[PDB]
């Protein structure tokens, strides 16, 4: 869904 | 904050003070907005964003924004009083007709500058039109203002357009013209044109003054969310009785600004070209 912590690394 | 000296409190958005600049020496308004569980208020955000791009003589000028982590300060140019207190003071005797015409011209110029941009005031009332000693009136209180680059969906009551009361879906520039026309009538007659106590009361007062809107005078009234068949079929009152002091040109202009149809309602740019303003001057109040 729209609730997520983006792991950019 | 540290560069200003609060002279007095002129209102209670947050509390607004009258302050003096220690360096430049000019007197300014110091509307202060508290920052705490929602961050910067949306009204303050819109006011600062839209006002800082509106540079017109007939618009309150936001000179500086003292934005800190704990408090937010707005620095406007200081005007002596607004149209509401000036009208209350000028209650025993009417405001002079040249002064009313000049104030309407300046308000329409400010509205036309706003509408040339994408700024919809949406809160045009005499309490939001400050006046300086040099016979100038400016638009103020842009907290409720919205940017209508894309159409603005609908959310005091006396200066609310009939469409907003009749379940309007999208805001239009005609609501500002309606509010300005109500202010014009109030200035002429020293009385609120539609002092409705409630939504339906305000609607009924509007219908009593201007006649119950039919489909010929306004296409689309019947197919509206807030229109009911149980509406009294009032007749349009003659504008001579509504605004006796107004002349033919003023009555025609007021009728055009109070048009039921938002699409057929006059605009600020078109109102500025009305013959009512062919002899407009700049008198002091």
């Amino acid at each position: 869904n729209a609730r997520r912590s983006i792991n950019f690394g | 904050m540290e560069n200003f000296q609060k002279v007095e409190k002129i209102g209670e958005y947050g509390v607004v003070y009258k302050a003096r600049n220690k360096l430049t020496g000019e007197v300014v308004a110091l509307k202060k907005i508290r920052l705490d569980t929602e961050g910067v208020p949306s009204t303050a955000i819109r006011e600062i964003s839209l006002l800082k791009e509106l540079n017109h003589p007939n618009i309150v000028k936001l000179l500086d924004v003292i934005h800190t982590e704990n408090k937010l300060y707005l620095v406007f140019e200081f005007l002596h009083q607004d149209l509401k207190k000036f009208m209350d003071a000028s209650a025993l005797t009417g405001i002079p007709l040249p002064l009313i015409k000049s104030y309407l011209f300046q308000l329409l110029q400010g509205l036309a500058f706003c509408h040339s941009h994408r700024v919809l005031h949406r809160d045009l009332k005499p309490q939001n039109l400050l006046i300086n000693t040099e016979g100038a009136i400016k638009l103020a209180d842009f907290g409720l203002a919205r940017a209508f680059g894309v159409p603005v969906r609908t959310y005091t009551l006396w200066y609310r357009a009939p469409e907003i009361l009749l379940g309007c879906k999208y805001y239009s520039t005609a609501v500002d013209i309606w509010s300005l026309g109500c202010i014009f009538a109030e200035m002429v007659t020293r009385r609120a044109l539609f002092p409705g106590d409630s939504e339906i009361d305000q609607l009924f007062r509007i219908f009593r003054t201007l006649g119950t809107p039919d489909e010929v005078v306004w296409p689309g009234v019947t197919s509206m969310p807030d229109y009911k068949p149980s509406f009294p079929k009032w007749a349009r009152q003659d504008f001579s009785k509504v605004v006796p002091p107004l002349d033919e040109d003023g009555r025609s202009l007021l009728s055009q600004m109070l048009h039921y149809d938002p699409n057929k309602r006059i605009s600020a740019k078109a109102a500025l070209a009305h013959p009512f303003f062919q002899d407009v001057t700049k008198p002091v109040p």
């Binding site: 912590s5 | 961050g39 964003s49 839209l50 934005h67 040339s116 680059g149 894309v150 740019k269």
Partner: protein
């Protein structure tokens, strides 16, 4: 006043234009990170029923803030959240609470962190939150089309939103140019009509002036199903947008 509004928007879009190629100056985040952030912002706007203009404003705020400031990997989502909150406050009738955005970030940042980042973005942007977007110019162009095909408008919105994901090469085109290219692409896709003469007169953009952006947007539209970010394609699959994302892009542009 419509022509005055269009002229003012054309003037303002230059002043609100983000720095071109600011990701080169960013030592920690890359354009892929920005694309992922924009995809997540599309998902968030879908979740909270935010308007497309709110998403465009948030993207513009992020681009300008990252042009002016340097942001690490762990703070890019915080910057995006602050931009979304600011855009919702500026545009929405009832913007979501700060706690809503804190929850939607999967509690990566606290409410205090979100508010501090919002203050930082407001200070950096100097409260210039009225930036023109592709949505506004697209609506102005829609006012100049007849017959008003809803599929044209939906496809133009879809392409304009697609332009938000990729900074390269859509950060070197003005929002008016992107909106014109999207309108022409939609018109040719669903009706086969080209850039209208009325819009040529109104905007001054001939079909040749939009050619670079036209080629870039055609390439994006053709490669949209294969793109790493698919939130916009899913969003525009609904009957609200007439399912324009299911439409086959034209193989060639007869220019």
């Amino acid at each position: 006043y419509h022509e005055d509004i269009h002229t003012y928007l054309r003037e303002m879009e230059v002043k609100c234009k983000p720095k071109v190629g600011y990701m080169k100056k960013q030592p920690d985040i890359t354009n892929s990170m920005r694309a992922i952030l924009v995809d997540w912002l599309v998902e968030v706007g879908e979740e909270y029923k935010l308007q497309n203009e709110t998403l465009h404003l948030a993207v513009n705020y992020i681009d300008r803030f990252l042009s002016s400031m340097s942001v690490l990997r762990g703070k890019l989502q915080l910057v995006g959240t602050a931009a979304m909150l600011l855009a919702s406050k500026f545009e929405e009738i009832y913007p979501p609470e700060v706690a809503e955005f804190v929850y939607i970030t999967d509690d990566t940042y606290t409410k205090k962190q979100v508010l501090r980042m919002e203050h930082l973005v407001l200070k950096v942007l100097t409260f210039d939150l009225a930036a023109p977007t592709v949505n506004q110019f697209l609506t102005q162009y829609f006012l100049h089309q007849q017959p008003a095909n809803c599929k044209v408008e939906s496809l133009a919105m879809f392409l304009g939103e697609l332009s938000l994901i990729d900074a390269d090469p859509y950060l070197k085109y003005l929002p008016s140019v992107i909106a014109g290219a999207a309108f022409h692409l939609a018109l040719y896709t669903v009706t086969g009509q080209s850039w209208p003469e009325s819009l040529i007169r109104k905007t001054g953009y001939t079909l040749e002036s939009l050619k670079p952006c036209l080629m870039d947007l055609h390439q994006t539209y053709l490669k949209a199903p294969q793109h790493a970010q698919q939130s916009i394609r899913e969003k525009y699959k609904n009957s609200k947008y007439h399912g324009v994302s299911l439409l086959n892009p034209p193989e060639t542009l007869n220019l």
